[PDB]
Design a protein around this motif. Structure first.
Motif, PDB file in Angstrom:
ATOM      1  N   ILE D 232       3.017 -47.345  31.465  1.00  0.00           N
ATOM      2  CA  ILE D 232       1.916 -48.560  30.980  1.00  0.00           C
ATOM      3  C   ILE D 232       2.442 -49.336  29.779  1.00  0.00           C
ATOM      4  CG2 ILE D 232      -0.344 -48.735  30.028  1.00  0.00           C
ATOM      5  CD1 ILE D 232      -1.121 -45.988  30.780  1.00  0.00           C
TER       6      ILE D 232
ATOM      7  N   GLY F 109     -13.088 -54.401  25.437  1.00  0.00           N
ATOM      8  CA  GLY F 109     -12.015 -53.950  25.245  1.00  0.00           C
ATOM      9  C   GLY F 109     -11.492 -52.521  25.513  1.00  0.00           C
ATOM     10  N   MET F 112     -11.332 -50.219  22.540  1.00  0.00           N
ATOM     11  CA  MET F 112     -12.829 -49.669  22.065  1.00  0.00           C
ATOM     12  C   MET F 112     -13.272 -48.410  23.031  1.00  0.00           C
ATOM     13  SD  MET F 112     -16.279 -51.411  21.099  1.00  0.00           S
ATOM     14  CE  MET F 112     -15.437 -52.878  20.615  1.00  0.00           C
ATOM     15  N   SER F 115     -11.494 -45.117  22.727  1.00  0.00           N
ATOM     16  CA  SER F 115     -11.700 -44.211  21.435  1.00  0.00           C
ATOM     17  C   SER F 115     -13.025 -43.284  21.476  1.00  0.00           C
ATOM     18  CB  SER F 115     -11.846 -44.957  20.199  1.00  0.00           C
ATOM     19  OG  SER F 115     -12.983 -45.736  20.273  1.00  0.00           O
ATOM     20  N   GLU F 117     -14.739 -41.498  24.818  1.00  0.00           N
ATOM     21  CA  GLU F 117     -14.430 -40.441  25.476  1.00  0.00           C
ATOM     22  C   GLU F 117     -13.398 -40.983  26.756  1.00  0.00           C
ATOM     23  OE1 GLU F 117     -17.129 -37.356  26.761  1.00  0.00           O
ATOM     24  OE2 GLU F 117     -18.716 -38.539  25.508  1.00  0.00           O
ATOM     25  N   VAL F 120      -7.696 -41.076  28.409  1.00  0.00           N
ATOM     26  CA  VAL F 120      -6.381 -41.452  29.251  1.00  0.00           C
ATOM     27  C   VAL F 120      -6.831 -42.023  30.354  1.00  0.00           C
ATOM     28  CG1 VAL F 120      -4.443 -40.441  29.980  1.00  0.00           C
ATOM     29  CG2 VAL F 120      -5.481 -39.475  28.053  1.00  0.00           C
ATOM     30  N   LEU F 123      -7.386 -45.480  29.898  1.00  0.00           N
ATOM     31  CA  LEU F 123      -6.205 -46.418  29.687  1.00  0.00           C
ATOM     32  C   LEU F 123      -5.354 -46.549  30.900  1.00  0.00           C
ATOM     33  CD1 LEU F 123      -5.118 -44.647  26.141  1.00  0.00           C
ATOM     34  CD2 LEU F 123      -5.845 -46.994  26.581  1.00  0.00           C
ATOM     35  N   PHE F 124      -5.431 -45.482  31.786  1.00  0.00           N
ATOM     36  CA  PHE F 124      -4.973 -45.912  33.279  1.00  0.00           C
ATOM     37  C   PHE F 124      -5.731 -46.724  33.907  1.00  0.00           C
ATOM     38  CE2 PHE F 124      -3.067 -41.337  33.342  1.00  0.00           C
ATOM     39  CZ  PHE F 124      -1.992 -41.565  32.816  1.00  0.00           C
ATOM     40  N   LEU F 132      -7.089 -57.376  30.000  1.00  0.00           N
ATOM     41  CA  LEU F 132      -6.797 -58.186  28.625  1.00  0.00           C
ATOM     42  C   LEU F 132      -7.742 -57.664  27.572  1.00  0.00           C
ATOM     43  CD1 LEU F 132      -4.696 -59.962  27.042  1.00  0.00           C
ATOM     44  CD2 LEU F 132      -6.362 -61.756  27.758  1.00  0.00           C
TER      45      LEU F 132
ATOM     46  N   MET I   5      -8.134 -43.290  14.632  1.00  0.00           N
ATOM     47  CA  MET I   5      -9.325 -43.612  14.003  1.00  0.00           C
ATOM     48  C   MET I   5      -9.623 -42.715  12.690  1.00  0.00           C
ATOM     49  SD  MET I   5     -10.325 -45.672  16.259  1.00  0.00           S
ATOM     50  CE  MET I   5     -12.049 -46.188  16.071  1.00  0.00           C
ATOM     51  N   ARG I 493     -22.624 -39.519  16.781  1.00  0.00           N
ATOM     52  CA  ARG I 493     -21.426 -39.884  17.232  1.00  0.00           C
ATOM     53  C   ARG I 493     -21.751 -41.119  18.401  1.00  0.00           C
ATOM     54  NH1 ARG I 493     -15.814 -40.137  18.728  1.00  0.00           N
ATOM     55  NH2 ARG I 493     -16.757 -39.526  21.054  1.00  0.00           N
ATOM     56  N   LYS I 497     -20.842 -45.026  18.340  1.00  0.00           N
ATOM     57  CA  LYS I 497     -19.913 -45.700  19.180  1.00  0.00           C
ATOM     58  C   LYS I 497     -20.540 -46.540  20.035  1.00  0.00           C
ATOM     59  CE  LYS I 497     -15.932 -43.948  18.331  1.00  0.00           C
ATOM     60  NZ  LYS I 497     -14.669 -45.089  17.745  1.00  0.00           N
TER      61      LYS I 497
END
Ligand SMILES: Nc1ncnc2c1ncn2[C@@H]1O[C@H](COP(=O)(O)OP(=O)(O)OP(=O)(O)O)[C@@H](O)[C@H]1O
Ligand SMILES: [Mg+2]
Ligand SMILES: [Zn+2]
Ligand SMILES: [Zn+2]
Ligand SMILES: [Zn+2]
Lengths: 65, 114, 263, 243, 43, 159, 134, 83, 773, 98
Positions: D232, F109, F112, F115, F117, F120, F123-124, F132, I5, I493, I497
């Motif tokens: 990545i 984004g 956010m 962070s 749940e 990964v 992100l993948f 972006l 964080m 939480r 969030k």
RNA sequence: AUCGAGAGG
């Protein structure tokens, strides 16, 4: 452990009234209250010092070292 | 670990004075005296004799924190009467009373002899 | 004399029950606080342990030794350690004691305060003696030894006041009371059904007239008569305890006066 | 703590002179707040104190077995015989002025226990001590001279206050803060920043002119390197392409 | 020491409760409160 | 029930009325039953209010249900907080749950969203889709160790 | 500097409600018809019974600054009375067409006075020295 | 782009965030040996001099308030009202 | 989530906390050892060369000193190993990491940080003990005790950061909470139990003690108040010398059910110009109350003033309680003999009543245990009330309940009358065995004693069956503290969030991080939640005739005519068609406001939270500008009518020359305008509030000024504040329930799982219900 | 009338740590649980041979005292011979606010 | 370091 010297609450010496306390309890056959009063311990702050005391030193004296 | 020395209750410092006298602008002829290494034993006693003076309009002491052995005494007197003179008079009266009590107790103990 | 008056109603070798009169509350409270706190006394301060085979810790025994009441009648002649041009030990600022005990007997051997021995030169002063009040002649039970256990200590006793440590305080308990009847109304009694039958009547009520029944409240009356009972551990005689308390309070007041004059 | 869940810590240690005293000279070894009990509802504490007072005065041993016929009315009828108020109240005088107190104070013996928790074994303070080798953050533990965790909830609290410099300083100056060189074309942490020669090179795109430096937490750098190792590309760009 | 020697652990709400059948067999009062409440019992 | 009705003299009087309560919701059918008041029927199922009356009535029902729980014992929380919470759950035209399924699947984004749940997986997906990140959020500026556009940092100071 | 309201009141009821040293007395003016008083009194310093007669006077001054303890030599005012209180007026109510009421607070002890025109010198001032003579 | 001096539709009152940031920035600048524009007299703590400058409106900074679309408005510290 | 964080930070300390009445609200006591470990890098300037170099020569051993001298290059000179004198003379631009000294802003925190008041900026005071000593009033926001609790201290390391700490996170700035628009700090514990005993009609103080108490006020002006009683004996009432702490110019009127101007029972409160006229000071006045003294002194004057007031009250009350005393014993829980048998009867019949209920049982359903449980709870409550009523006033536990310092009615009932009914999981004790709860009962036994009714009190003692039932009930209070606390922390939480990026922008709209408009104005009016008080709208309620008599003025007919005594020109007001035209338009506006408010509030409720308190401004104008009611006013009708109209155009929330923003402005300040017209009508400003021209102008200026202070500051993190204000009450509501141990609180058992439905928009509702009219 | 068994003593349902509490039936159950948890942290003489064992973190109170109010179960628990507390003189008073 | 236990708010 041995004998509570003095008295946290006031400061009266009670470290010299342990053997006399035991003699009063055993040799004179008196109860705890009469023995404590005969030792001059009037205030119940001093009275609890001798009434509630565990003489663990004897047990520590039963080991070889 | 962080406990202070127990002789700091009655020993002065290096450049520390027993009395620190500062004029007070809140009221006329008023003053605040800080006593160092003192307790309630000698703050209440001085205040009681200050209140017995007919030319004293205000007299009050306080310990700001029990951690520290000092106390502040505010004295306000009638105009024309110096508060330092009031403190001296109170101290002299205390000394005279204590001497009289000593003499009386000695006499009573002497008579007490069986 | 002219001001305060005293009446010794009971006097023994350890307790003095007296009645102060013609004094304010502040003076009596200051006197009792001085008697508890600021009258000097001699007590063990520095313990050096040479041999300790006993089942007790060195610092345990040192703390017990520090609490032993020692004779302090002539304490006024010694100097403070801080004010003495000396070392950790001396003759005009400290008293040296030595404790040597060995468990030779088959049964338990008791080490008492009677076994303490003064080594330094007293220079003809009635100070530094373990205090014996037990009828058997034995002092305070310092320790116990089984057999073959040995204790060797050198103690240095220094002058001090009860403010620095409670081991220097020769006043065991100072009973202080005033106004046995609730004439001045300085106390609001807590009751369930009756306030006069649930609160025990103090002994000092035998020395004051009862507050009648319906007489109007006396708002101009202050506290004047104080019933005191001063005890002593034994280091200083009771009469000497109270006299030295008054002397110490007078010394504090005179020191403040002197500081004011010097400024 | 007593034997009833009545835990506490020492807030002040007054001497014997400053402590309130009764008419017979007894001075408490401990003073506890009356406000502790009415919500905790630990009546057994008061019953134990009364029974202990009676036992100390009489010389006997108090029987505090749970399901017995011993009642507070029976203990009170024994304390009154000794010359004390049947409910344990006692007239105590102020230690400062020596004057009586309008309220009589509940006074008596109570069995208290010292717990393993002491301040000298809890106090800690960190002034940039040792750090970890993986994330280069302050190590964990009082025994390791470590720092305290500024968790997510604390970060949210600082966000609510609207303080932005303190949050960054807690996240950068207080921890991590490792600067990294970024290429101006590919946007990855590939620049071979050879210092002492004033030369920066980015092989793979032949960029030796567009190089910047960014101050980011070392944890962020390690996150980006782990993402790169997971196929990545988290390309960090300085300028904005789309408004 | 005695409490440790007379402890009981349940490897695991309803389980974290004082059941009616614990009368005289498990202490109703002695139990931890460090997220193991009710799971760890004492005889 | 008792309802405060304005009396003809202008006062408010607690007049009594008979109100029926059922175990089960069939709002779209009960509302059309003759004899009842169609403008006052209410349900504790705010999902069924949205499907029959709209997202705005769903917003009102959501606020009512939140209020009945936050302020049941007698506790009081200012209207602004509950109003904002209900609005955030409804600005997208539907009941957006406070869960990784509902609010973590937005156009925000990826820094956010990762962070909270499913870090990964988020992100993948961002890497696969080449998302972006504008770095305008708070979490994005926290990861990068920068002064976030928070109060005291929501503006620039020049000379 | 002078009196504002002098009158004689006969007490009809003394109320010891929940207080050991304070009682709320109610009194009616002996001379003028519509004039009543409701006053809190420290019973310990000044006991008051039923059917007692009290001369009440509003000194408002004893002829701003810090209070000075009394000293021998001066006489000032409040020397022929038995009970003196100093407080602040905090309410002026209109009971009826020919009735006014003034409320005073002597540090927490409340007094209410009612009248027709005898309560004319009473102004909303902290200057109020309630003087009571047996 | 940039809203002109006129047509500015933002509060002329200084928000607590703006005031705190201005005070912090000025205090940091003063501690870095920057020219003080006001007679500091007995004050030595840089935050105290920053507060004194703000009270007399002598801080030469300017707030760039950013609208959500990216445009901004410049408000002088002297121009802003402090309550 | 574990390294980015939330990190581990340097320059932090953790220590056990303890109380200190002799510390200010914003002060924290730092141990000397900690102060010599934590450090702050101070840049040397021409204004601090001497002090910094003296600290350097002090070394890292003496407390006033330094541990490092950072040079311009970056090299650090350690002052413990390397040389620390000689050519160590500092040069401009160097950094000297000094020890923490007095008056230093430090962040101070306690976990869990459920809300922004759990993390506040305090002021360092070096102390000689290893404890984080702190004020007893600041413990409420932290939810802190002094029975083993530990707290964390963070030291800022910059000049901007110290300013941010001291201007946003300071303790005085956090007195009034934005969650429930009421103070979060008040007088607590002893000071609350003395404040009521000092402020009784039965309390008098002599000269010697008054002098000491007056000296204990640091802000006392040196003037001895005139004693309440003069001749028989100079005595000061407690309210007299407690009012020395109250700042001058503070007015507060409270009227309870029994409150009158004479307040026989000392109900309510009346403080005029900072002087307590009457009323016992208790939790409703000096506590964390909606409209108490703290709110008035905070909203008025300043928070710092309020911070000074906290200490001024605490010192006086603690000194008075030191020389008075206060205790608690067994006899405080013992009820009167004749009042005990009644309690027994109060139980017995109720128990037999339950017996009758079970006869209805014989002939899912429930509606029996539910009704039986309710009957038993009512029996416990009525027995407790009968016990509390017949408790004497000198009872110590009753005084604590009266003050509100600690304890409550349920505590009285359980310690003196009966423990009550024990319930687990919302239901009474179930049958663990077959057809019985314990082996000591016969099967098929449904008596209240058999299923967990404790007829005994703690004083009397619990029988073994009742003891076991109480243990079963009280265990649930520990399970929901260690098990169900995680189910409400996840809620918070998720809420944080979800609303993390929500904030108010400079165009007064509430937007997401993408710019999506959550709200066009925050809270639909754009007002800060900390500048809001509960206020009554007088137009909505009352009769039509009462409303007309309130606001209708007719200058032509005798029906509703202004008294000429009110207004100086009230002789020529009669007639004057132009004035009637100006005066009936305001009545039409009031009628429109009445109908609009009755449309908005269907139930007719009049008390709603609004920004600016108007009654307080009226009182301040009346007292500041001394007004005599026996004098005509000076206000022309054209000034009262047009003054409010001109003021309405100065209540600016939104700014813009366009029409959309102007309409949004008109919509925003609309209900507040209704309140303003209800409070500043011509009859009110002439008859009810006899204001003058100067007083009216002052009132208008103050309303305009205070309204412009309540507008939210762009930059507020609304979403995080809203998320914390929702989950914090739930989290603190749970983690409790060991304080009562058996009482039925549905909101901790069935309340939070409902929040778990709404937040997740649960598709299936535990119990759906339809309400039809 | 159909009793089939009787209990030896109702107080034998408590554990080792809960048998130290005096009058546990006059006390709230969470308080009993708190004491049971805190009864294992009380400092006292854990063993008579503490001077022979090389064990980490040994804490021994100088002057352990037997309680003035003792339960009947303390005899079998050896609590009067190895006590873990002292009989302080406690006053319940709002003395100085500390 | 990893793992696990126990314990405090
Ligand atoms: N599992 C937990 N999660 C979060 N916070 C906790 C948890 N357990 C304890 N705490 C913290 O510790 C405090 C509990 O205090 P403690 O256990 O001393 O009981 P208490 O409420 O102080 O009453 P008492 O002291 O009478 O038992 C709470 O305020 C809470 O902040
Ligand atoms: Mg645990
Ligand atoms: Zn004693
Ligand atoms: Zn020497
Ligand atoms: Zn590149």
């Amino acid at each position: 452990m041995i004998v509570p010297v003095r008295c946290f609450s006031c400061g009266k010496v009670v470290g010299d009234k342990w053997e006399s306390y035991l003699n009063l309890l055993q040799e004179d056959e008196l109860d705890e209250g009469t023995a404590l009063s005969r030792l001059g311990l009037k205030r119940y702050c001093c009275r609890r010092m001798i009434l509630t005391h565990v003489d663990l030193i004897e047990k520590f004296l039963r080991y070889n070292p | 670990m962080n406990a202070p020395d127990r002789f700091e209750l009655f020993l002065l410092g290096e450049g520390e004075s027993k009395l620190k006298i500062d004029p007070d602008t809140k009221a006329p002829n008023a003053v605040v005296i800080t006593f160092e290494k003192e307790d309630h034993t000698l703050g209440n006693l001085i205040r009681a004799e200050l209140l017995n003076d007919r030319k004293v309009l205000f007299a009050a002491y306080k310990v700001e924190h029990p951690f520290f052995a000092r106390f502040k005494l505010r004295i306000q007197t009638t105009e024309g009467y110096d508060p330092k003179d009031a403190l001296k008079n109170a101290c002299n009266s205390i000394i005279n009373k204590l001497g009289a009590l000593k003499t009386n107790f000695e006499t009573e103990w002497n008579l007490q002899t069986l | 004399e002219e001001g305060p008056q005293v009446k010794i109603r009971e006097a023994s070798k350890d307790n003095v029950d007296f009645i102060l009169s013609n004094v304010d509350l502040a003076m009596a409270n200051s006197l009792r606080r001085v008697m508890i706190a600021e009258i000097p006394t001699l007590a063990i301060d520095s313990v050096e342990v040479e041999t300790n085979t006993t089942v007790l810790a060195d610092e345990f025994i040192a703390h017990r030794l520090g609490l032993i009441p020692l004779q302090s009648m002539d304490i006024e002649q010694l100097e403070y350690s801080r004010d003495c041009f000396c070392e950790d030990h001396c003759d005009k600022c400290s008293v040296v004691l030595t404790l040597q005990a060995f468990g030779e007997s088959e049964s338990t051997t008791n080490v008492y305060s009677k076994d303490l021995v003064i080594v330094s030169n007293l220079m003809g002063r009635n100070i530094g003696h373990p205090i014996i009040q037990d009828k058997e002649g034995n002092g305070v039970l310092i320790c116990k030894l089984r057999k073959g256990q040995e204790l060797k200590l050198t103690c240095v006793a220094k002058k001090g006041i009860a403010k620095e440590h409670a081991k220097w305080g020769p006043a065991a308990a100072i009973e202080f009371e005033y106004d046995p009847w609730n004439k001045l109304k300085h106390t609001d009694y807590w009751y369930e059904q009756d306030s006069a039958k649930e609160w025990p009547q103090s002994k000092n009520c035998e020395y004051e007239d009862p507050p009648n029944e319906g007489d109007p409240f006396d708002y101009k009356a202050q506290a004047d008569t104080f019933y005191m009972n001063v005890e002593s551990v034994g280091s200083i005689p009771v009469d000497q305890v109270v006299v030295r308390g008054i002397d110490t309070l007078q010394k504090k007041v005179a020191s403040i006066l002197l500081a004011l004059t010097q400024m | 703590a007593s034997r009833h869940g009545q835990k506490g810590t020492i807030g002040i240690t007054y001497r014997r002179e400053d402590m309130p005293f009764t008419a017979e000279g007894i001075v408490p070894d401990l003073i506890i707040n009356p406000h502790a009990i009415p919500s905790r509802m630990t009546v057994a504490h008061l019953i134990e104190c009364l029974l202990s007072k009676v036992a100390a005065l009489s010389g006997n041993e108090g029987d505090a077995s749970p399901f017995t016929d011993i009642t507070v009315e029976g203990i009170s009828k024994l304390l009154r015989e000794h010359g004390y108020q049947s409910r344990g109240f006692e007239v105590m005088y102020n230690g400062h002025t020596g004057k009586k107190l309008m309220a009589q104070i509940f006074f008596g013996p109570t069995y208290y226990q010292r717990l393993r928790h002491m301040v000298d074994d809890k106090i800690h303070a960190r002034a940039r001590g040792p750090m970890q080798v993986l994330t280069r953050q302050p190590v964990e533990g009082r025994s390791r001279d470590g720092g305290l965790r500024f968790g997510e909830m604390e970060r949210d609290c600082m966000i609510a206050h609207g303080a932005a410099s303190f949050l960054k300083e807690r996240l950068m100056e207080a921890s991590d803060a490792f600067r990294v060189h970024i290429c101006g074309i590919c946007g990855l942490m590939t620049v071979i920043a050879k210092l002492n020669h004033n030369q920066f090179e980015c092989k793979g795109c032949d960029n030796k002119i567009d190089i910047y430096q960014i101050h980011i937490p070392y944890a962020a750098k390690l996150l980006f390197q782990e993402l790169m190792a997971m196929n990545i590309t988290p390309r960090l760009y300085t300028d904005r392409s789309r408004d | 020491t005695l409490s440790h020697l007379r402890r009981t652990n349940t490897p695991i709400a309803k389980p974290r409760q004082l059941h009616n059948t614990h009368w005289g067999l498990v202490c109703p009062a002695e139990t931890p409160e460090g997220q193991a409440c009710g799971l760890v019992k004492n005889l | 029930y008792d309802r405060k009705v304005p009396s003809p003299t202008g006062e408010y009087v607690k007049e009594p009325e008979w109100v029926l309560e059922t175990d089960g919701v069939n709002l779209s059918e009960v509302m059309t039953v003759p004899g009842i008041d169609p403008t006052r029927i209410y349900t504790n199922s705010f999902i069924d209010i949205m499907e029959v009356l709209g997202i705005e009535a769903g917003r009102a029902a959501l606020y009512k249900e939140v209020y009945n729980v936050i302020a049941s014992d007698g506790s009081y929380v200012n209207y602004r907080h509950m109003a904002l919470l209900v609005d955030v759950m409804t600005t997208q035209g539907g009941l957006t749950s406070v869960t990784r399924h509902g609010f973590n699947r937005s156009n925000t984004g990826a820094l956010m969203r990762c962070s909270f749940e499913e870090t990964v997986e988020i992100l993948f997906e961002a890497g696969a889709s080449a998302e972006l990140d504008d770095c305008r959020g708070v979490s994005e500026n926290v990861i990068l160790g920068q002064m976030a556009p928070i109060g005291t940092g929501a503006f620039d100071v020049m000379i | 500097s002078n009196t504002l309201f002098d009158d004689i009141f006969q007490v009809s009821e003394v109320d010891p409600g929940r207080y050991n040293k304070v009682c709320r007395i109610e009194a009616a003016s002996t001379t003028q018809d519509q004039c009543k008083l409701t006053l809190d009194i420290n019973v310990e310093l000044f006991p008051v019974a039923a059917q007692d007669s009290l001369t009440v006077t509003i000194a408002s001054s004893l002829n701003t600054r810090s209070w000075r303890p009394p000293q021998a030599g001066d006489r000032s005012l409040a020397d022929d009375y038995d009970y003196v209180m100093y407080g602040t007026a905090y309410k002026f109510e209109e009971v009826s067409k020919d009735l006014i009421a003034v409320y005073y607070s002597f540090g927490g002890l409340l007094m209410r006075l009612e009248g027709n025109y005898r309560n004319l010198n009473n102004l909303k001032q902290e200057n109020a020295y309630l003087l009571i003579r047996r | 782009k940039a809203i002109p001096k006129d047509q500015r539709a933002t509060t002329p009152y200084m928000t607590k965030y703006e005031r705190a940031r201005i005070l912090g920035t000025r205090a940091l600048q003063i501690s870095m040996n920057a020219p003080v524009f006001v007679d500091l007299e007995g004050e030595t703590d840089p935050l105290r001099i920053a507060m004194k400058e703000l009270a007399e409106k002598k801080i030469p900074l300017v707030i760039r308030r950013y609208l959500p679309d990216g445009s901004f408005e410049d408000w002088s510290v002297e121009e802003l009202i402090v309550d | 989530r574990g390294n980015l964080m939330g990190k581990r930070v340097d320059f932090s300390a953790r220590t056990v906390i303890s109380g200190d009445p002799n510390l200010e609200l914003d002060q924290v006591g730092v141990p000397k050892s900690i102060a010599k470990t934590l450090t702050y890098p101070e840049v040397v300037t021409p204004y601090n060369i001497d002090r910094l170099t003296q600290l350097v020569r002090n070394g890292p051993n003496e407390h006033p000193g330094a541990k490092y001298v950072i040079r311009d290059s970056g090299d650090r000179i350690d002052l413990r190993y390397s040389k620390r004198a000689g050519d160590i003379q500092l040069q401009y631009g160097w950094k000297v990491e000094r020890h923490i000294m007095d008056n230093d802003p430090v962040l101070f925190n306690r976990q869990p940080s459920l809300h922004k008041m759990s993390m506040m900026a305090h002021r360092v005071k070096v102390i000689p003990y290893s404890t984080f000593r702190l004020n007893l009033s600041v413990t409420s926001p932290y939810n802190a005790d002094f029975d083993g609790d530990e707290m964390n201290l963070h030291v800022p390391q910059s000049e901007e950061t110290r300013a941010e700490l001291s201007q946003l996170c300071a303790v005085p700035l956090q007195i009034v909470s934005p969650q429930s628009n009421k103070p979060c700090m008040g007088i607590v514990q002893d000071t609350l139990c003395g404040i009521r005993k000092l402020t009784l009609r039965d309390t008098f103080i002599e000269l010697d003690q008054v002098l000491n108490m007056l000296y204990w006020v640091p802000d006392w002006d040196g003037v001895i108040p005139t004693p309440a009683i003069i001749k028989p004996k100079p005595l000061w009432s407690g309210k007299q010398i407690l009012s020395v702490a109250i700042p001058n110019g503070i007015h507060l009127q409270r009227f309870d059910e029994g409150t009158t101007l004479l307040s026989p029972k000392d109900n309510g409160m009346l403080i005029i110009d900072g002087q307590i006229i009457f009323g016992v000071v208790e939790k409703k006045t000096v506590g964390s109350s909606n409209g108490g003294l703290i709110h008035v002194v905070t909203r008025e004057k300043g928070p710092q003033v309020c911070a000074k007031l906290f200490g001024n009250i605490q010192k006086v009350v603690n000194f008075w309680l030191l020389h008075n005393g206060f205790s608690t014993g067994i006899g405080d829980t013992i009820a009167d003999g004749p009042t005990m048998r009644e309690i027994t009867e109060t139980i017995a019949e109720a128990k037999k009543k339950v017996l009758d209920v079970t006869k209805e049982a014989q002939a899912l359903r429930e509606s029996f245990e539910d009704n039986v449980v309710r009957f038993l709870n009512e029996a416990r409550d009525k027995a407790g009330r009968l016990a509390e009523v017949n408790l004497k006033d000198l009872n110590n536990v009753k005084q604590m309940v009266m003050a509100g310092s600690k304890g409550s009615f349920i505590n009285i009932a359980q310690m003196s009358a009966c423990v009550g009914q024990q319930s687990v999981e919302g239901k009474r004790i179930a049958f663990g065995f077959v057809d019985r709860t314990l082996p000591h009962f016969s099967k098929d036994d449904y008596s209240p004693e058999s299923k967990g009714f404790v007829e005994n009190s703690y004083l009397r003692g619990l029988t073994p069956q009742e003891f076991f039932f109480h243990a079963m009930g009280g265990r649930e209070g520990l399970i929901d503290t260690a098990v169900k606390t995680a189910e409400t922390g996840y809620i918070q939480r998720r809420l944080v969030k979800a609303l993390e990026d929500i904030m108010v922008h400079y165009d007064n709209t509430t937007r997401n991080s993408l710019g999506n408009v959550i709200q066009f104005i925050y809270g639909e009016d754009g007002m800060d939640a900390a500048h809001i008080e509960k206020q009554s709208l007088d137009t909505i309620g009352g009769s039509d005739a009462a409303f007309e008599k309130r606001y209708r003025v007719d200058l032509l007919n005798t029906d509703h005519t202004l008294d000429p005594s009110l207004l100086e020109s009230g002789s020529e007001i009669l007639g004057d068609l132009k004035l009637q035209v100006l005066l009936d338009e305001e009545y039409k506006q009031l009628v429109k406001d009445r109908k609009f408010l009755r449309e908005v509030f269907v139930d007719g409720e009049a008390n709603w939270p609004l920004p600016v308190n108007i009654r307080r401004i009226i009182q301040n104008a009346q007292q500041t500008f001394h007004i005599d009611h026996t004098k005509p006013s000076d206000l022309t009708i054209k000034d009262i009518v047009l003054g409010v109209k001109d003021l309405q155009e100065n209540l600016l929330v939104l700014r813009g020359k366009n029409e959309i923003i102007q309409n949004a402005q008109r919509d925003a300040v609309t209900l507040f305008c209704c309140l303003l017209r209800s409070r500043l009508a011509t009859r009110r400003v002439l008859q009810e509030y006899r204001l003058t021209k100067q007083a009216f102008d002052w009132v208008l200026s103050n309303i305009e000024a205070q309204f412009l202070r309540s507008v939210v500051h762009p930059g507020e993190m609304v979403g995080v504040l809203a998320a914390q204000s929702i989950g914090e009450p739930a989290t603190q509501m749970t983690l409790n329930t060991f304080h009562f141990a058996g009482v039925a609180s549905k909101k901790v058992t069935s309340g939070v799982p409902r929040l778990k439905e709404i937040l997740n928009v649960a598709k299936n509702m535990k119990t759906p219900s339809l309400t039809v009219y | 009338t159909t009793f089939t068994h009787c209990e030896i003593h109702p107080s034998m349902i408590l554990g080792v740590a809960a048998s130290i509490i005096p009058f546990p039936d006059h006390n709230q159950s969470p308080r009993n649980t708190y004491q049971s948890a805190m009864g294992k942290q009380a400092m006292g003489v854990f063993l008579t041979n503490y001077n022979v064992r090389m064990d980490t973190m040994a804490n021994i109170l100088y002057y352990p005292q037997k309680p003035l109010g003792t339960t009947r179960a303390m005899e079998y628990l050896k609590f009067r011979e190895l006590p873990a507390g002292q009989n302080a003189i406690v006053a319940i008073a709002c003395y100085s606010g500390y």
